[PDB]
Amino acid sequence: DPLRPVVDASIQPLLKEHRIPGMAVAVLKDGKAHYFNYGVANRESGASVSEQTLFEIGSVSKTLTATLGAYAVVKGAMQLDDKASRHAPWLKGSVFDSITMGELATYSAGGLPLQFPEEVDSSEKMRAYYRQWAPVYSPGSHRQYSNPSIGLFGHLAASSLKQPFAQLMEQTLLPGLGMHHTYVNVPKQAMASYAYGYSKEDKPIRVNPGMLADEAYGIKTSSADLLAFVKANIGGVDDKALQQAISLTHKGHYSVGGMTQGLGWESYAYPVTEQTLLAGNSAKVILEANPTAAPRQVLFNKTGSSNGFGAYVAFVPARGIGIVMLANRNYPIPARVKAAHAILAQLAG
Numbered sequence: 649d650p651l652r653p654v655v656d657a658s659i660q661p662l663l664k665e666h667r668i669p670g671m672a673v674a675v676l677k678d679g680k681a682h683y684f685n686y687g688v689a690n691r692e693s694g695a696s697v698s699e700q701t702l703f704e705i706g707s708v709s710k711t712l713t714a715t716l717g718a719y720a721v722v723k724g725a726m727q728l729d730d731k732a733s734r735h736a737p738w739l740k741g742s743v744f745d746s747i748t749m750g751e752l753a754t755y756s757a758g759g760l761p762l763q764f765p766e767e768v769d770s771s772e773k774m775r776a777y778y779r780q781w782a783p784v785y786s787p788g789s790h791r792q793y794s795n796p797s798i799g800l801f802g803h804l805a806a807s808s809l810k811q812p813f814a815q816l817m818e819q820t821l822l823p824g825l826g827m828h829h830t831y832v833n834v835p836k837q838a839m840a841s842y843a844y845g846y847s848k849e850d851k852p853i854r855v856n857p858g859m860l861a862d863e864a865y866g867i868k869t870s871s872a873d874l875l876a877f878v879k880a881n882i883g884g885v886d887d888k889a890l891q892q893a894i895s896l897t898h899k900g901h902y903s904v905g906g907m908t909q910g911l912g913w914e915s916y917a918y919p920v921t922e923q924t925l926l927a928g929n930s931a932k933v934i935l936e937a938n939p940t941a942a943p944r945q946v947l948f949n950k951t952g953s954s955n956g957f958g959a960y961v962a963f964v965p966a967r968g969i970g971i972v973m974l975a976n977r978n979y980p981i982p983a984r985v986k987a988a989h990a991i992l993a994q995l996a997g
């Protein structure tokens with residue numbers, strides 16, 4: 649493959665610097681998938697990474713949850729300007745009478761935190777958490793990146809379609825997108841393809857179920873499946889409702905600096921500087937409340953991490969280019985962004 653030198657040149661330094669046990673990289677260009685696989689999925693077995701290896705993609709899950717939400721809209725089961733409580737009887741009476749589904753989706757409901765408090769470890773406690781939550785900001789005025797926010801969005805979109813979220817994803821949406829090895833619950837027959845994550849102390853680890861984990865950060869997938877999702881986000885899919893769903897995930901709702909927030913995907917004018925891409929993926933944007941501003945060739949991306957795992961996806965529909973990078977080390981986001989940026993610049997020519 650004459651792309652191998654270019655990918656290796658950006659990826660090998662990451663592997664060495666962060667002692668990354670394994671990484672699966674997939675690149676799209678001119679309709680063609682290219683797979684570059686490094687290292688091991690499992691340091692005990694020494695099993696090689698391939699484009700079939702399953703990794704935890706963490707928050708990249710949010711792009712798939714967002715697509716489910718968009719699908720519920722397309723099917724007429726909900727609208728982004730629905731009040732959250734329209735789709736959850738147990739939110740009737742709360743501030744979620746006056747927060748919208750779109751606001752949940754785009755982390756703009758008013759300061760829902762990054763994570764549930766540790767004590768919120770059950771259905772009952774989760775419902776009470778949301779019912780007792782006090783808005784920090786007016787709905788729509790601040791982006792506070794939030795698992796409880798988009799997690800609730802995903803959970804209520806599923807409810808709007810009268811099916812459990814895991815079932816909708818695994819039986820309808822993901823097979824619809826061409827993603828047959830993408831799971832919220834990895835089945836027995838796929839467990840042998842499931843990587844272990846590696847903590848900073850090199851302990852093997854995998855995600856634990858937390859409240860709304862499935863919706864907010866729970867997807868396990870391969871580089872091949874995630875590149876098919878990228879393909880679907882560029883070339884489209886056969887099913888028309890799905891196609892229209894995907895399109896909805898591309899539209900800008902608001903901007904923070906040079907990043908534009910959509911459903912799941914975060915977008916930039918392309919060509920995009922390394923500086924701009926780093927800023928919109930900065931700790932500031934991830935961790936703090938930032939005021940929303942009016943929204944924006946376009947690059948779409950999403951970062952994802954779990955304990956022991958680090959993922960990144962970026963693509964540029966107008967140029968037919970895309971990259972997936974899945975590792976079983978949670979290595980720093982700036983390193984993901986710089987490597988992706990240099991590889992995509994080489995593909996774009």
Ligand SMILES: O=C(Cc1cccs1)N[C@@H](Cn1cc(C(=O)O)nn1)B(O)O
Nearest residue numbers: 706707708795865951952953954955978
């Ligand atoms: O919430 C998750 C999954 C988890 C990772 C750690 C605990 S649950 N990931 C999202 C935000 N996050 C990233 C991180 C982190 O890496 O510390 N902690 N939280 B994400 O953006 O991938």
Ligand SMILES: [Zn+2]
Nearest residue numbers: 652653656657
């Ligand atoms: Zn090489």
Ligand SMILES: [Zn+2]
Nearest residue numbers: 771803804807
């Ligand atoms: Zn529920």
Ligand SMILES: [Zn+2]
Nearest residue numbers: 823827828829
């Ligand atoms: Zn299938």
Ligand SMILES: [Zn+2]
Nearest residue numbers: 827828829830
């Ligand atoms: Zn299969």
Ligand SMILES: [Zn+2]
Nearest residue numbers: 828829872873
């Ligand atoms: Zn597959």
Ligand SMILES: [Zn+2]
Nearest residue numbers: 832833857862
């Ligand atoms: Zn589960």
Ligand SMILES: [Zn+2]
Nearest residue numbers: 847848849850
């Ligand atoms: Zn430590």
Ligand SMILES: [Zn+2]
Nearest residue numbers: 881895898965
């Ligand atoms: Zn588009």
Ligand SMILES: [Zn+2]
Nearest residue numbers: 750751754901
């Ligand atoms: Zn919106």
Ligand SMILES: [Zn+2]
Nearest residue numbers: 790937938939
């Ligand atoms: Zn402010």
Ligand SMILES: [Zn+2]
Nearest residue numbers: 993995996997
């Ligand atoms: Zn050129």
